[PDB]
Amino acid sequence: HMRHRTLSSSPALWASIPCPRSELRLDLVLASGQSFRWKEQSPAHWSGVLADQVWTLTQTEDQLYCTVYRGDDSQVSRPTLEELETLHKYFQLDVSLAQLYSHWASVDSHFQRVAQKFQGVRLLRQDPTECLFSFICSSNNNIARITGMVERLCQAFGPRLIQLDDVTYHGFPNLHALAGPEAETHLRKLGLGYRARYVRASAKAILEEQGGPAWLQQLRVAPYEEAHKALCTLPGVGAKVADCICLMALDKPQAVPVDVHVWQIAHRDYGWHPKTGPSPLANKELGNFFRNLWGPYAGWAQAVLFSADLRQ
Ligand SMILES: Cc1ccc(CNC(=O)c2ccc(F)nc2)cc1
Numbered sequence: 001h002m003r004h005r006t007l008s009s010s011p012a013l014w015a016s017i018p019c020p021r022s023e024l025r026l027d028l029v030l031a032s033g034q035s036f037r038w039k040e041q042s043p044a045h046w047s048g049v050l051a052d053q054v055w056t057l058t059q060t061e062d063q064l065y066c067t068v069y070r071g072d073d074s075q076v077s078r079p080t081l082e083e084l085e086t087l088h089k090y091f092q093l094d095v096s097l098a099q100l101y102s103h104w105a106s107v108d109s110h111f112q113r114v115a116q117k118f119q120g121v122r123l124l125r126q127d128p129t130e131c132l133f134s135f136i137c138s139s140n141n142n143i144a145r146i147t148g149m150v151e152r153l154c155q156a157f158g159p160r161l162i163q164l165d166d167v168t169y170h171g172f173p174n175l176h177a178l179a180g181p182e183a184e185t186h187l188r189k190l191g192l193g194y195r196a197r198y199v200r201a202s203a204k205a206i207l208e209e210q211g212g213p214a215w216l217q218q219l220r221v222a223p224y225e226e227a228h229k230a231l232c233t234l235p236g237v238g239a240k241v242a243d244c245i246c247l248m249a250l251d252k253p254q255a256v257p258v259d260v261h262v263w264q265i266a267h268r269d270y271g272w273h274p275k276t277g278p279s280p281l282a283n284k285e286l287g288n289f290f291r292n293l294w295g296p297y298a299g300w301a302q303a304v305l306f307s308a309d310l311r312q
Pocket residue numbers: 032033034138141142143244257299302303304306
């Protein structure tokens with residue numbers, strides 16, 4: 001019965017954050033395989049779950065408009081100050097992207113050329129539990145299929161928050177819910193395949209060998225290298241997934257996830273070859289190459305080129 005908002009339908013229920021389209025393009029960020037929880041349910045209006053709340057987001061040239069839905073049982077109102085700060089932190093808007101783009105452009109002509117067309121690609125700062133399990137589902141997969149598996153995972157295991165139109169929104173599950181005896185069987189029924197085992201076993205590992213979710217917060221303040229190696233102890237988490245999480249959830253802007261697309265970019269567009277085909281060692285070397293070239297926000301620079309490589 002409750003419907004998704006547009007900026008027309010409900011203009012009293014939107015707040016705005018001053019935000020140029022050079023600091024953020026929603027359409028290049030929300031569907032470029034960082035988060036899998038955002039959908040353009042009506043044109044230029046993106047809806048998705050952030051924490052225990054649904055949001056709809058849309059922007060003009062210089063403004064980011066947002067609206068919150070906190071549940072059927074609550075007086076509908078504009079986003080609060082605290083809710084607006086949550087969103088500001090999600091898009092890491094304290095960090096100037098125009099300043100990073102110019103620093104990257106100054107050492108890399110190729111980046112200059114591509115960036116010109118693909119402005120406002122930045123990194124979301126995600127919840128570690130969601131990012132972890134979303135990227136365990138990301139192996140040998142495409143964005144549409146990952147999106148399906150994550151949505152069904154949240155429906156089956158996570159709390160219902162609200163329904164807008166024909167879409168039921170659920171919160172991301174806690175570890176205990178994913179770690180249970182029938183968890184893998186259920187997740188296989190939901191189409192996850194072998195990834196169902198890694199989900200359940202990683203949920204179990206964090207709870208029994210690492211102390212629950214306080215461990216992921218500890219990794220967020222640990223140094224990149226310690227976080228990465230600690231992530232790689234988990235079932236289904238290797239170098240690539242650990243670097244995605246590090247970059248996207250554990251505040252490591254220098255993490256450079258290397259897989260097929262970045263290997264292809266590096267070869268095709270930079271002429272890079274290993275000095276010592278893909279391998280664990282050559283992938284590591286290529287991440288180091290990009291850090292050396294771009295600096296301590298190398299992962300953000302990579303996301304600009306990944307998002308562009310996604311738009312052909
Ligand atoms: C075909 C496909 C595309 C994306 C994924 C998962 N996302 C990334 O690897 C990723 C996205 C953004 C970024 F900045 N760094 C890494 C899996 C398959």
